[PDB]
Design an enzyme around this catalytic site. Sequence first.
Site, PDB file in Angstrom:
ATOM      1  N   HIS A   1      -1.175  11.113  -0.045  1.00  0.00           N
ATOM      2  CA  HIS A   1      -1.032  10.208  -1.189  1.00  0.00           C
ATOM      3  C   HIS A   1      -0.720  11.148  -2.395  1.00  0.00           C
ATOM      4  O   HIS A   1      -1.117  12.329  -2.383  1.00  0.00           O
ATOM      5  CB  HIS A   1      -2.402   9.566  -1.506  1.00  0.00           C
ATOM      6  CG  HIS A   1      -2.844   8.515  -0.528  1.00  0.00           C
ATOM      7  ND1 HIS A   1      -4.034   7.860  -0.623  1.00  0.00           N
ATOM      8  CD2 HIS A   1      -2.245   8.026   0.581  1.00  0.00           C
ATOM      9  CE1 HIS A   1      -4.169   6.990   0.384  1.00  0.00           C
ATOM     10  NE2 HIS A   1      -3.119   7.066   1.153  1.00  0.00           N
TER      11      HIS A   1
ATOM     12  N   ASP B   1      -9.847  -2.695   7.218  1.00  0.00           N
ATOM     13  CA  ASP B   1      -9.244  -1.620   6.453  1.00  0.00           C
ATOM     14  C   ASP B   1      -9.505  -1.817   4.964  1.00  0.00           C
ATOM     15  O   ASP B   1      -9.745  -2.932   4.499  1.00  0.00           O
ATOM     16  CB  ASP B   1      -7.707  -1.643   6.701  1.00  0.00           C
ATOM     17  CG  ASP B   1      -7.088  -0.319   6.269  1.00  0.00           C
ATOM     18  OD1 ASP B   1      -7.800   0.713   6.209  1.00  0.00           O
ATOM     19  OD2 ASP B   1      -5.860  -0.337   6.050  1.00  0.00           O
TER      20      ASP B   1
ATOM     21  N   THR C   1      -7.955  -2.103   1.880  1.00  0.00           N
ATOM     22  CA  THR C   1      -7.411  -3.058   0.938  1.00  0.00           C
ATOM     23  C   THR C   1      -7.913  -4.436   1.001  1.00  0.00           C
ATOM     24  O   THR C   1      -8.363  -5.064   0.024  1.00  0.00           O
ATOM     25  CB  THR C   1      -5.838  -3.007   1.059  1.00  0.00           C
ATOM     26  OG1 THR C   1      -5.552  -1.591   1.226  1.00  0.00           O
ATOM     27  CG2 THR C   1      -5.226  -3.474  -0.258  1.00  0.00           C
TER      28      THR C   1
ATOM     29  N   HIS D   1       2.508   7.876   5.809  1.00  0.00           N
ATOM     30  CA  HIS D   1       1.712   9.001   6.295  1.00  0.00           C
ATOM     31  C   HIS D   1       2.359   9.590   7.582  1.00  0.00           C
ATOM     32  O   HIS D   1       2.195  10.784   7.822  1.00  0.00           O
ATOM     33  CB  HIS D   1       0.328   8.461   6.786  1.00  0.00           C
ATOM     34  CG  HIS D   1      -0.639   8.280   5.682  1.00  0.00           C
ATOM     35  ND1 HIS D   1      -1.150   9.319   4.910  1.00  0.00           N
ATOM     36  CD2 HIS D   1      -1.185   7.121   5.190  1.00  0.00           C
ATOM     37  CE1 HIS D   1      -1.979   8.801   4.026  1.00  0.00           C
ATOM     38  NE2 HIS D   1      -1.995   7.482   4.161  1.00  0.00           N
TER      39      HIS D   1
ATOM     40  N   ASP E   1       0.892  -1.192   0.000  1.00  0.00           N
ATOM     41  CA  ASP E   1       0.000   0.000   0.000  1.00  0.00           C
ATOM     42  C   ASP E   1       0.924   1.235   0.000  1.00  0.00           C
ATOM     43  O   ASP E   1       1.830   1.277   0.859  1.00  0.00           O
ATOM     44  CB  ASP E   1      -0.790  -0.022   1.355  1.00  0.00           C
ATOM     45  CG  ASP E   1      -2.011   0.926   1.169  1.00  0.00           C
ATOM     46  OD1 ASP E   1      -1.734   2.063   0.733  1.00  0.00           O
ATOM     47  OD2 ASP E   1      -3.139   0.479   1.391  1.00  0.00           O
TER      48      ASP E   1
ATOM     49  N   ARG F   1     -15.779   3.364   3.666  1.00  0.00           N
ATOM     50  CA  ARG F   1     -14.790   2.465   4.242  1.00  0.00           C
ATOM     51  C   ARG F   1     -14.767   2.522   5.755  1.00  0.00           C
ATOM     52  O   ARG F   1     -14.208   1.686   6.476  1.00  0.00           O
ATOM     53  CB  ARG F   1     -13.378   2.799   3.698  1.00  0.00           C
ATOM     54  CG  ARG F   1     -13.007   4.254   3.934  1.00  0.00           C
ATOM     55  CD  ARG F   1     -11.681   4.642   3.338  1.00  0.00           C
ATOM     56  NE  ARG F   1     -10.573   3.927   3.948  1.00  0.00           N
ATOM     57  CZ  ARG F   1      -9.317   3.988   3.540  1.00  0.00           C
ATOM     58  NH1 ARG F   1      -9.019   4.668   2.441  1.00  0.00           N
ATOM     59  NH2 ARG F   1      -8.376   3.392   4.262  1.00  0.00           N
TER      60      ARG F   1
ATOM     61  N   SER G   1      -7.240   4.306  -0.713  1.00  0.00           N
ATOM     62  CA  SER G   1      -7.080   2.862  -0.837  1.00  0.00           C
ATOM     63  C   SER G   1      -8.359   2.145  -1.164  1.00  0.00           C
ATOM     64  O   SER G   1      -8.371   0.992  -1.597  1.00  0.00           O
ATOM     65  CB  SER G   1      -6.546   2.361   0.550  1.00  0.00           C
ATOM     66  OG  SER G   1      -5.222   2.913   0.696  1.00  0.00           O
TER      67      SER G   1
ATOM     68  N   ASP H   1      -1.452   0.423  -4.610  1.00  0.00           N
ATOM     69  CA  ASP H   1      -2.727   1.083  -4.872  1.00  0.00           C
ATOM     70  C   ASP H   1      -2.578   2.481  -5.395  1.00  0.00           C
ATOM     71  O   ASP H   1      -3.439   2.957  -6.162  1.00  0.00           O
ATOM     72  CB  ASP H   1      -3.634   1.017  -3.649  1.00  0.00           C
ATOM     73  CG  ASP H   1      -3.028   1.571  -2.389  1.00  0.00           C
ATOM     74  OD1 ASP H   1      -3.854   1.999  -1.521  1.00  0.00           O
ATOM     75  OD2 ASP H   1      -1.793   1.683  -2.223  1.00  0.00           O
ATOM     76  N   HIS H   2      -1.623   3.268  -4.920  1.00  0.00           N
ATOM     77  CA  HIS H   2      -1.385   4.642  -5.337  1.00  0.00           C
ATOM     78  C   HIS H   2       0.051   5.046  -4.875  1.00  0.00           C
ATOM     79  O   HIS H   2       0.692   4.227  -4.207  1.00  0.00           O
ATOM     80  CB  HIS H   2      -2.389   5.614  -4.625  1.00  0.00           C
ATOM     81  CG  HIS H   2      -2.421   5.380  -3.160  1.00  0.00           C
ATOM     82  ND1 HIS H   2      -1.440   5.827  -2.277  1.00  0.00           N
ATOM     83  CD2 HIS H   2      -3.264   4.595  -2.437  1.00  0.00           C
ATOM     84  CE1 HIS H   2      -1.732   5.357  -1.077  1.00  0.00           C
ATOM     85  NE2 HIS H   2      -2.799   4.605  -1.147  1.00  0.00           N
TER      86      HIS H   2
ATOM     87  N   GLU I   1      -1.388  -8.243   1.290  1.00  0.00           N
ATOM     88  CA  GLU I   1      -1.114  -6.871   1.466  1.00  0.00           C
ATOM     89  C   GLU I   1      -0.055  -6.562   2.536  1.00  0.00           C
ATOM     90  O   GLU I   1      -0.251  -6.918   3.705  1.00  0.00           O
ATOM     91  CB  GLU I   1      -2.373  -6.032   1.859  1.00  0.00           C
ATOM     92  CG  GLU I   1      -2.044  -4.550   1.848  1.00  0.00           C
ATOM     93  CD  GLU I   1      -3.022  -3.664   2.560  1.00  0.00           C
ATOM     94  OE1 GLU I   1      -3.881  -4.164   3.332  1.00  0.00           O
ATOM     95  OE2 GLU I   1      -2.941  -2.447   2.384  1.00  0.00           O
TER      96      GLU I   1
ATOM     97  N   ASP J   1       2.267   2.304   3.483  1.00  0.00           N
ATOM     98  CA  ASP J   1       1.471   3.482   3.474  1.00  0.00           C
ATOM     99  C   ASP J   1       1.343   4.106   4.865  1.00  0.00           C
ATOM    100  O   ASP J   1       1.540   5.310   4.959  1.00  0.00           O
ATOM    101  CB  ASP J   1       0.126   3.255   2.821  1.00  0.00           C
ATOM    102  CG  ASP J   1      -0.917   4.318   2.963  1.00  0.00           C
ATOM    103  OD1 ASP J   1      -1.170   5.087   2.030  1.00  0.00           O
ATOM    104  OD2 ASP J   1      -1.592   4.309   4.013  1.00  0.00           O
ATOM    105  N   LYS J   2       1.018   3.344   5.891  1.00  0.00           N
ATOM    106  CA  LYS J   2       0.691   3.942   7.207  1.00  0.00           C
ATOM    107  C   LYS J   2       1.865   4.680   7.773  1.00  0.00           C
ATOM    108  O   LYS J   2       1.776   5.778   8.313  1.00  0.00           O
ATOM    109  CB  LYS J   2       0.158   2.839   8.118  1.00  0.00           C
ATOM    110  CG  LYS J   2      -1.111   2.196   7.585  1.00  0.00           C
ATOM    111  CD  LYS J   2      -1.727   1.214   8.562  1.00  0.00           C
ATOM    112  CE  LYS J   2      -2.818   0.403   7.870  1.00  0.00           C
ATOM    113  NZ  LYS J   2      -4.007   1.275   7.545  1.00  0.00           N
TER     114      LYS J   2
HETATM  115 ZN   LIG Z   1      -4.144  -0.848   2.671  1.00  0.00          ZN
HETATM  116 ZN   LIG Z   2      -3.232   3.085   0.088  1.00  0.00          ZN
HETATM  117 ZN   LIG Z   3      -2.805   6.016   2.741  1.00  0.00          ZN
END
Ligand SMILES: [Zn+2]
Ligand SMILES: [Zn+2]
Ligand SMILES: [Zn+2]
Lengths: 449, 449
Positions: free
Chosen positions: A412, A153, A155, A331, A51, A166, A102, A369-370, A322, A327-328
């Site tokens: 993102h 979450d 994903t 961030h 992610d 979500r 996501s 994902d991005h 995943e 990602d987390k």
């Molecule tokens: Zn995710």
């Molecule tokens: Zn993501």
């Molecule tokens: Zn994110």
Amino acid sequence: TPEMPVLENRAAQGDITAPGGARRLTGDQTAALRDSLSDKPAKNIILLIGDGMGDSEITAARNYAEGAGGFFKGIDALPLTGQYTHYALNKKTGKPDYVTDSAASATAWSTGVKTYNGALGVDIHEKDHPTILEMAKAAGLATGNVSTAELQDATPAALVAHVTSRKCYGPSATSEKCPGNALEKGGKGSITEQLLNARADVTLGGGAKTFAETATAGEWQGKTLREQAQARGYQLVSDAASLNSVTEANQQKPLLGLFADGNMPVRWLGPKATYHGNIDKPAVTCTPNPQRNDSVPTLAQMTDKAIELLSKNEKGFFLQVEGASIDKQDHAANPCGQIGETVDLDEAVQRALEFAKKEGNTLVIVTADHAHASQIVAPDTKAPGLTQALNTKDGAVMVMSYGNSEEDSQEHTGSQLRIAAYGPHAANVVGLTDQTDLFYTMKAALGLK
Amino acid sequence: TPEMPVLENRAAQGDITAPGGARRLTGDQTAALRDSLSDKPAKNIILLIGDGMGDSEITAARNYAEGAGGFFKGIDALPLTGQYTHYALNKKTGKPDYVTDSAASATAWSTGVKTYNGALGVDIHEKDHPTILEMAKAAGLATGNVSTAELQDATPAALVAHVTSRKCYGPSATSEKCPGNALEKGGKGSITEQLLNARADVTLGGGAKTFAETATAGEWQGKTLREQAQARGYQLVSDAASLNSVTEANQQKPLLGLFADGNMPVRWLGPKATYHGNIDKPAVTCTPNPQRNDSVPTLAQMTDKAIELLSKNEKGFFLQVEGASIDKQDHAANPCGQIGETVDLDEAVQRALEFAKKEGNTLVIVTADHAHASQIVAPDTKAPGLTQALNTKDGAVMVMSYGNSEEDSQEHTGSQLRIAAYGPHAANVVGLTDQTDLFYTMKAALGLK
Ligand SMILES: [Zn+2]
Ligand SMILES: [Zn+2]
Ligand SMILES: [Zn+2]
Ligand SMILES: [Zn+2]
Ligand SMILES: [Zn+2]
Ligand SMILES: [Zn+2]
């Protein structure tokens, strides 16, 4: 008999300061590429998602962990590569929304339709669309869903849940935020409840916390979702030993692994990046997280176990894995957490490719994902945002920068990013494609109608 | 027959809000890819460089000009794709320097050896290495060098010059900055003098300014660089009609186009990004530069002219084309300038592809020297750097962010980035490779000794 070759070694071939020493190739690749091209059907698919793992994130982790001229034996090993776009849509206008979340992106690869940020398994008009997982299951294939994040979450949930938000993890939030999905209001239910209905063969992750909520209506009204799962025949495991002990997982005895109350613990610790942290502070060396665990399965371990289990189905299997915390931690502007989660994903990809090479009828896919915040900049950089210098494997300093948000969470980004694959139908990820093309590639690969 | 296919259409197939509408693929690509694979020799090579054009710049540009589901007929049309690394070396230690400049990176692709930032055609030991252009010359091929920057700039300079610092434009700077290269001290001379000696058949770009300088030593002592040029057989041109007039370019009558004193003018204008510009200021629509000129040839034009002239050579040719101002406007935090120069490169790449498709023995490569600062972020982003909202072809807003420097120039970034190719030996760019592999690839495709 690995009929189709994987890239065995694309690290620099010699001394990087000398002529040709930094080469990653040793000769012409034409024949090896020809050999990697097959249109035979795929028996199995393993989709690996980092992610927020854009090219920047892969580069940073490689530099740190393997060195500039190094090579990820999993991540970098896939022979067919391309770039894909993951734009979402604006719910109201139906026009592109340049930077996805996501939920919208996972809905995209899992159903083949673009949607709005925060949507799971629904289109802009809130209509449900079947996922790749529901389709495979209906076809008779075994199905697995693994993540180091909480199972509710985005994903992982995207494959099993169709909700307008979500955020609707369990009964309580669903009632408030997805009234149309609320069980008590005649809806299909919260993410967790739909996950229990989807009944994949193997589901492993975090998110035990939500399983504590009680259902508001239906057959299991007033009981906890955990109780519901037991009533429904799931086998519940919550540690590494318990997981290893499992010898069977199927429609009769589906496996549900809940290894943490929320997300699973990260592999590595380090401080958060800070304003002028590369000038004011000394270089950081990441360190293993003691809270990581011997009772806690790693991603590679969860990946291996799922494969063993699902591989018992003669018709084939679909597996999504995943690496959720890249990602987390991006961030969180925490380089070490971010990079450690990428090395973690690489071990998981190695396990998937070993199986695939051996099996010969398995399509392996590695993407994100991005894109994300992190950037690799010069050591003497004076940046407006958060920075940190790191001591890499090369014995050199690398600085990383997070400068896209004044808010508590870095953002993102919208850039197209790497997609790589190995196996039958792999050609479909080469060149420029769209995230929705991935659903169609997986579908056609397995021969789903 | 077009034995070698390009991608004719990778735009969204239909309605992006409907299932499958956002796909770029129409069906299985296996066969098309197979058909894209050939190991025969390349007769010619056309290398297109977008200075600082990482995946982010390409995406932002596509989004703005063609829309999210749009497609660049040049850039996005090369069927074989990969990701390459461009790290440089620290001069004192021989260890990696994660973030390269334009001189070290062009040295790597032009010579096959890594070097330190600021170096041109020399290794960390300040020892000269032959360039791919000098090698093609020596084997009898026609050679061309085109850019929108000053021809003494790093990118085009790296094919014809060997100096210890890229600042060594002419005699003045060289005597000062690269004493050992100074003509008067036995050096091979300044970038401009060395360019005059390298004698490519076709050299088109800016940088007329340094040619006013006079030699401090040598056969052409006391004369200006321009006089030495005409004096040496050079056919000089300074505008489009004059450029159009040209009927031949060869070792006897080499061509030298100087279309500007400094860099050639950019295609599009717009305001610079500002702090909170996406919140505090209205969305931007880019404006064509009315001072760009009917007297100045565009990149596509220089490109068409160069191919025609070099193609007259039966042995074949090597051509490098640089879309130089992508990086320059990225540094300036000017979205419109940056995007316009990518759209500009796309037209040039389209001309190269048309020829290559027709010719049949042409390897065309499109890539960048390194990554850059620009990021695509959410519309409502509150960033600590410079941001701007733009009105895209989709009729929606896209916001661009520049957040890696507090100085007046945004920084390069280290991320691996897209490399793409079409023609014989293009397989060699698929997967992960390094920038130095590009030299080896090109040299081998052409069979240079
Ligand atoms: Zn995710
Ligand atoms: Zn993501
Ligand atoms: Zn994110
Ligand atoms: Zn550059
Ligand atoms: Zn340049
Ligand atoms: Zn630059």
